[PDB]
């Protein structure tokens, strides 16, 4: 198991533009295209992201390409954020993957506001972190996924993805 596999299970793969859980235009492996309600905006952003006139559709490879850039950006995001990096460097490989997940999902900013879980995580207080993390909009809105992620952060193992 690894971040790419982990994320490919949580996010799925769609070759045509779609709306996500919040109702926003997405494509491929969870690549958010735009929070705007215009399908045309989405397609424009899409064509820009891709480099051709896709007409709202991409190949498996182009999606994979986006996913890679996205996983990268996410990690970089982490490393460039003052509240995040120390937490993350403190963590083992598994649990880092859990951090990347959340970030891929909710941006750096939002994860950066889990102040309290951040400290518990840093002190390696796994169970308390886990309870804290669950008290969130994230968890109530996407409970099955949040639990996989929380279990991974709480255990340091891939059992929830098995
Ligand atoms: Cl892009
Ligand atoms: Cl769910
Ligand atoms: Xe983190
Ligand atoms: Xe995490
Ligand atoms: Xe977190
Ligand atoms: Xe956790």
Swiss-Prot record:
Residues given in the record as substrate binding sites: 32, 104, 117, 132
Role this protein plays: Endolysin with lysozyme activity that degrades host peptidoglycans and participates with the holin and spanin proteins in the sequential events which lead to the programmed host cell lysis releasing the mature viral particles. Once the holin has permeabilized the host cell membrane, the endolysin can reach the periplasm and break down the peptidoglycan layer.
GO molecular function list: lysozyme activity
Keyword match Hydrolase: yes
Effect of residue 132 to M/F: 2-fold decrease in enzymatic activity
Main subcellular location: host cell
Family: Belongs to the glycosyl hydrolase 24 family.
Protein's UniProt name: Endolysin
Coiled-coil annotated spans: none
EC code(s) of this entry: 3.2.1.17
Catalytic activity of the protein: Hydrolysis of (1->4)-beta-linkages between N-acetylmuramic acid and N-acetyl-D-glucosamine residues in a peptidoglycan and between N-acetyl-D-glucosamine residues in chitodextrins
UniProt xrefs under Pfam families: Phage_lysozyme
UniProt pH dependence: Optimum pH is 7.3.
Keywords for the protein's UniProt record, in alphabetical order: Antimicrobial, Bacteriolytic enzyme, Cytolysis, Glycosidase, Host cell lysis by virus, Host cytoplasm, Hydrolase, Viral release from host cell
Subcellular location: Host cytoplasm
Effect of residue 20 to A/N/S/T: Complete loss of enzymatic activity
Induction (record text): Expressed late in the viral replication.
Gene Ontology CC annotations of this record: host cell cytoplasm
């Amino acid at each position: 198991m690894n971040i790419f596999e982990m994320l490919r299970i949580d996010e799925g793969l769609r070759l045509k533009i779609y709306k996500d859980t919040e109702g926003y235009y997405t494509i491929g492996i969870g690549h958010l295209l735009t929070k705007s309600p215009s399908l045309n905006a989405a397609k424009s952003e899409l064509d820009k992201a891709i480099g051709r006139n896709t007409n709202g559709v991409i190949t498996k490879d182009e999606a994979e390409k986006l996913f890679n850039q996205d996983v990268d950006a996410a990690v970089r995001g982490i490393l460039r954020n003052a509240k995040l990096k120390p937490v993350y460097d403190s963590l083992d490989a598994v649990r880092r993957a859990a951090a990347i997940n959340m970030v891929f999902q909710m941006g750096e900013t939002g994860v950066a506001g889990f102040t309290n879980s951040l400290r518990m995580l840093q002190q390696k207080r796994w169970d308390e972190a886990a309870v804290n993390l669950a008290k969130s909009r994230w968890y109530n809105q996407t409970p099955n996924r949040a639990k996989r992620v929380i279990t991974t952060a709480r255990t340091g193992t891939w059992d929830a993805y098995k």
